[PDB]
């Protein structure tokens, strides 16, 4: 395998779904996992319970590269944002730095209207 052993983590967080992606510092992807692969298929994906499952599945996939140095970067609000951290701590990975990399727009485009119902 690659045996780079320095793959960082990209835990994308959303209200509807949970996206997990682990890649090297350069950005060439190694492995990824989401709630949809596990078979939830609906609002159950929005629940935080599938987030740690997808994260630990991505960790099992990363076991092939034998990587154990992590940098966690999260984007977006919603439940399941922190469950991936507990997952990657339970599997036994070492994490170098922990921070939020959510993007804030500086006077971006006009957002959509508010939902009345």
């Amino acid at each position: 395998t690659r045996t780079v052993s320095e793959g960082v983590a990209h835990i994308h967080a959303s209200f509807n779904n949970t996206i997990v992606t682990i890649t090297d510092r350069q950005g060439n992807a190694l492995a990824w996992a989401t709630s949809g692969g596990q078979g939830f298929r609906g609002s159950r994906k929005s629940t935080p319970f599938a987030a740690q499952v997808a994260a630990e599945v991505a960790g099992k996939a990363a076991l092939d590269y034998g990587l154990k140095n992590l940098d966690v970067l999260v984007k977006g609000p919603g439940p399941g944002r922190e469950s991936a951290v507990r997952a990657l701590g339970a599997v036994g990975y070492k994490i170098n730095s922990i921070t939020d990399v959510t993007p804030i727009p500086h006077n971006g485009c006009r957002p959509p209207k508010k939902r009345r119902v």
Binding site: R110, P111, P112, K113, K114
Partner: peptide, 21 residues
Amino acid sequence: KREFYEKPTQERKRKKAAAVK
């Protein structure tokens, strides 16, 4: 996130009035 074109004036003023007391 959403659009509020001028209603932040209302919300800021009322939150201020609450914070005064």
